[PDB]
Design an enzyme around this catalytic site. Structure first.
Site, mmCIF file in Angstrom:
data_model
loop_
_atom_site.group_PDB
_atom_site.id
_atom_site.type_symbol
_atom_site.label_atom_id
_atom_site.label_comp_id
_atom_site.label_asym_id
_atom_site.label_seq_id
_atom_site.Cartn_x
_atom_site.Cartn_y
_atom_site.Cartn_z
ATOM 1 N N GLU A 137 64.033 71.379 0.064
ATOM 2 C CA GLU A 137 63.514 72.847 0.434
ATOM 3 C C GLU A 137 64.670 73.557 0.709
ATOM 4 O O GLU A 137 65.263 73.992 1.841
ATOM 5 C CB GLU A 137 62.958 72.638 1.940
ATOM 6 C CG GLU A 137 61.694 71.850 1.997
ATOM 7 C CD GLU A 137 60.739 72.155 3.403
ATOM 8 O OE1 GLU A 137 60.439 73.171 3.604
ATOM 9 O OE2 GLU A 137 60.626 70.932 3.961
ATOM 10 N N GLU A 171 56.336 65.162 2.100
ATOM 11 C CA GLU A 171 56.729 65.048 3.518
ATOM 12 C C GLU A 171 54.923 65.424 4.395
ATOM 13 O O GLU A 171 54.615 66.475 4.110
ATOM 14 C CB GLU A 171 57.639 66.040 4.194
ATOM 15 C CG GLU A 171 58.905 65.862 3.628
ATOM 16 C CD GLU A 171 59.948 66.409 4.235
ATOM 17 O OE1 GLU A 171 61.206 66.452 4.142
ATOM 18 O OE2 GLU A 171 59.749 66.926 5.605
#
Lengths: 461, 461
Positions: B165, B365
Site C-alpha cells: 500500500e 489482508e
C-alpha cells in the site's frame, strides 16, 4: 477564373530528415553518417544535424504553416528516431513522445496530418549489417517499424504513405552516387526496386489488418513524370518506351494494378538482371494495392537514343537504352538546372484516369527552388517571390484542366512549407512559402504564403 | 455449504517492522526514529523495539501459525536491516543470516513464503539526506535493495510483492501526519505517489530479469475499497468519482494496466500539481505490469460533496474534491468505529474481473481489531473471539459470491497471524488468530485459530 472541386486539400510537404535536426536522435541514417564522415560532400558543410530546427520549434512552426494556408501537412517519421532495437522494433520512448507532440500540435493548429513512413533515411547500421534494401530481412524490419507507427498514431492519423519516391532510393543508393552508400550496380538496383515494392505491399497489408475506421487509408508517393521522345526517330521512340517502363511503370504498376509491367520483366529477364521473387511475395503485391497515389511532379523527362549500342560490352544499367535530351527553347529553372513544363500535369492526370482506374490521387509535391532569395527581400524582410506564385499558377492551371476532364485529383501539396534541408545541396535553393534564416532559425512568411492562404479561401484564383 | 476453489491458499499477513523488534538492527527506519525521539506519540508508550519478538522467537512462532492453519505467511524484509551501505546495497551479514533463518524455518514448518519488500519502513537516513521517496535516486537505491533480496532468497521464494500500500505512505508521510516526517504538502504527495509507482515497475523489471523458475511471480498490495457515493446527487456522484480515481486508480491502473488514469492526470494538470515524469520512466511503467494483485480490505468507504467549492483559496489537497460520509442505518463495529459491510468484497471481485483482465489476485489482508481481549479469556486461558469468527464467515461468504461469478481470486490472508505492533496504535487493538502477552512474549492460539485450521482442512464452511 480557375476553380477547384469542393473539399480540395491545400497542403505542404516536407520530411523528418530535412526539418527536425538530429537532436537527441538515437541512430544515424545513411545521410547522417555520410555527413559525419565526408562533410565536404555537402554545400558549405551544412548537414542535417540542425536542419530547420523542427525538433525544438515545431509548435510555432506549425502555427506559421497554418498562417500560410497549410490545411494539410505531409511529413515523415524517422525509423532512426522512433526505434530502439531494429530487429524487434522496440521503441525509443523520447522519439515516440516527440512524434505524439507534433501530431497533437498539428491537430491543435487545425492541420490534417499526412504521415509518410520513409524518405531516403535508411539506418546506416542496417546497411552495414545486411546491405540495407538489398535484404528481404530488412524489408521485414521495415514492416515492423510501420506496424508500431500505426498502433501508436493511428488513433488520430487517417492518411498514410509507405514511401516517398522509392525510385530515388534505387537511383541514389545504387545507380548514380546521389545517396550514401553510393553503390554503382545495375543488377543490385533491380533487386532493390523489387524489394521496396514488396515492402510497400507488405506494409499496406498490415495497415488494413490494423485499421479501425473506414476513412483510414494508405498510399505511396511517386514521380510519374512522362518520358517525351526527342523525335519520332524509331530509335528515340524506343528509348522513350523503355525510359517510360523503367522510370514510371516500375513502381506505378505494382502499387496500383498489383503486378510488374510485362514488357519490363521480359527485358530484365533477357538481359539476365531480373530480381529474385517468389510466388508468395508476388501474391502479396497483387492482393494489397495502395488506396491512393501521391504524385511528385517538378520537370519533364526527355530522352533520345543512346550514344552506343546497348549490346556494347559495358556493365548493365537502365541507361544503356536511353540518354537524356535537352530541348531547344525549353523553359528553365536555371539556378537549379530543371526544365519548367506545366502541361505534364495534364498528361499525368489523364494517364491516371484512363489507365489506372482513376484511383484517388493528389499532387503530393510541386515546387520551385531558387537561390539567394535575400536579394528579393523588401523593407520588412518579406521575400517577394512572385516567380513562385506564377510557377504555382501555371501548374495549377494545368491541373485544373485535368480535373475538368474528369481525373480524380483531390489535393495539391507545395514543396515546401518552410525552407528545409535539401540533402547535399543543403539550403542553396529555397522552396518554402516560409523563409528560414538558418543562422537564427527565425522564419517569416514569403509573399507566396499570403497568396497560398488566399487560394485556399477561394478554392481558386 | 460455502466452498472454495481447489488449491485456494489460506494464509496470514504481517510485516517485519511490526513483528521482529529492533534487536541488533543496523539502521533506523522512520518509525524507529519517531519512537526514539517522540515516544509520547505511541499508545501506552510501546514502540517497535521489541514488538512481537519475532527476531528471537521466529521458529516456535512459525510452529504456532502452522498449528493455526497458516498455509502461507506474508511478511516483509526490512531495508534497514538487510543493507549496510544504502548507496551500493551492500550486505549486513547478520541481517542476511536472519532472513535465511526465518525463510528456512517457514519451509521446515510447511508454510509457503510470501515476501513483501516494503511496509512503510523507509530508512530515516534516506529521508534526512534525500527527502526519501521524493528522490528518484532513492527510487534507484530501493531497486538495488530489492535486487539483493531476489538474488539472496529467490532460490526458495516464489511469491513476492513490491510494496504494501504505497498510498498509506503517501497519505501518512505527506498528507495527514500519520507517519514521520509528518509533512503536510499536497503537491509533494503527488510526486511521491508517482515515484513509488515508478519504483514498483522498476522492481518488477529487475525481478523478471533475474527470475529462473516459471512459478516465480511478483505483485503489489493495494487497498481497492470502492468509493460509494452518499446519494445519487450529481455533486455526490462527482465526489465519489474523484475519490475512486485518487484512492484506487492512482495505483491500480499503473500496476496492472501499465498507465495512469487519464481523468486523474487531466485534473492534476488543470490544478497545477501534476508529478514530474519523463517518457522513459512512463515506458518502464507501461512495460512492467505486476503478475498478481494483493487486495487489502477492512471496511467500506463512503463519500459526499466537499463543504466548500474546490475553487476556494486553500492549499491543494485531494480532499478539496470529496468528504467522508456516515450513512444512517450502517452496521457498526462500535468500539473500533468502523462500519461492517462485507458486500464490498464482492464489488472488488467483480471490478477486478471486468475491468482489469481478471488478473490473478488474492485477498492479502482482511481482519478485525478488538481492544482488551483479556475480557474473553476462558479458564484454559484462550481468547474466545467468536466475533472474529463471524466476521470472517461474513466476508468469506461475500468473497465466494465473487468467485462464483467468475473472479480469479486465489487466496485469503488474515490480518494477522500473531498479534503485532500497529504503528502508533501499538497493541491497543488485537487482530491475530494468536494472542501475544507482550510483557512476556508468550503466545497463545485463540478460538479463531482452530476454526481457521478447520476452515482450510475444509476449504469452506
Amino acid at each position: 477564373m480557375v476553380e477547384f472541386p469542393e473539399g480540395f486539400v491545400w497542403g505542404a510537404a516536407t520530411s523528418g530528415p530535412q526539418t527536425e535536426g538530429n537532436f537527441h536522435k538515437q541512430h544515424q541514417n545513411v545521410f547522417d553518417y555520410w555527413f559525419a564522415t565526408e562533410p565536404e560532400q555537402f554545400d558549405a558543410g551544412v548537414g542535417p544535424d540542425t536542419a530547420s530546427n523542427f525538433y525544438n520549434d515545431y509548435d510555432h512552426d506549425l502555427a506559421l504553416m497554418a498562417q500560410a494556408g497549410v490545411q494539410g501537412l505531409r511529413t515523415s517519421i524517422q525509423w532512426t528516431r522512433l526505434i530502439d532495437d531494429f530487429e524487434t522494433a522496440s521503441l525509443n520512448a523520447d522519439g515516440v513522445a516527440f512524434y505524439n507532440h507534433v501530431i497533437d500540435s498539428m491537430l491543435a493548429h487545425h492541420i490534417t496530418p499526412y504521415i509518410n513512413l520513409h524518405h531516403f533515411d535508411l539506418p546506416v547500421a542496417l546497411y552495414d549489417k545486411y546491405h540495407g534494401w538489398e535484404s528481404k530481412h530488412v524489408v521485414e524490419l521495415f514492416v515492423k517499424f510501420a506496424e508500431q507507427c500505426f498502433k501508436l498514431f493511428g488513433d488520430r492519423v487517417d492518411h498514410w504513405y509507405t514511401f516517398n519516391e522509392p525510385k530515388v532510393v534505387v537511383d541514389g543508393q545504387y545507380l548514380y552516387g546521389w545517396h550514401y552508400p553510393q553503390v554503382i550496380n545495375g543488377p543490385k538496383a533491380v533487386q532493390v526496386a523489387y524489394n521496396m515494392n514488396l515492402a510497400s505491399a507488405k506494409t499496406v497489408a498490415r495497415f488494413h489488418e490494423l485499421s479501425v475506421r473506414p476513412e483510414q487509408q494508405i498510399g505511396i508517393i511517386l514521380n510519374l513524370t512522362p518520358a517525351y521522345a526527342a523525335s519520332d526517330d524509331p530509335a528515340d521512340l524506343a528509348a522513350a518506351e523503355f525510359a517510360e517502363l523503367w522510370s514510371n511503370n516500375l513502381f506505378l504498376d505494382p502499387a496500383v494494378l498489383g503486378h510488374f509491367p510485362e514488357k519490363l520483366v521480359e527485358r530484365l529477364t533477357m538481359d539476365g538482371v531480373l530480381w529474385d521473387a517468389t510466388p508468395t511475395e508476388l501474391a502479396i503485391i497483387a492482393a494489397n494495392p495502395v488506396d491512393s497515389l501521391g504524385v511528385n511532379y517538378y520537370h519533364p523527362f526527355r530522352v533520345q537514343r543512346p550514344d552506343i549500342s546497348p549490346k556494347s560490352l559495358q556493365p548493365w544499367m537502365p541507361d544503356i537504352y536511353f540518354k537524356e535530351y535537352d530541348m531547344p527553347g525549353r523553359m528553365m529553372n536555371v539556378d537549379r538546372g530543371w526544365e519548367i513544363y506545366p502541361q505534364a500535369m495534364t498528361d499525368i492526370a489523364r494517364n491516371i484516369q484512363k489507365n489506372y482506374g482513376n484511383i484517388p490521387w493528389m499532387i503530393s509535391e510541386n515546387g520551385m527552388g531558387v537561390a539567394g532569395e535575400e536579394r528579393f527581400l523588401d523593407k520588412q524582410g518579406v521575400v517577394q517571390d512572385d516567380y513562385r506564385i506564377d510557377f504555382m499558377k501555371e501548374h495549377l492551371t494545368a491541373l485544373a484542366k485535368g480535373i475538368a476532364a474528369g481525373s480524380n485529383c483531390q489535393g495539391y501539396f507545395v514543396w515546401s512549407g518552410i525552407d528545409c534541408w535539401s540533402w547535399n545541396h543543403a539550403y542553396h535553393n529555397r522552396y518554402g512559402l516560409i523563409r528560414n534564416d538558418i543562422h537564427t532559425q527565425t522564419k517569416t512568411l514569403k509573399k507566396s504564403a499570403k497568396w497560398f492562404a488566399e487560394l485556399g479561401e477561394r478554392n481558386g484564383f
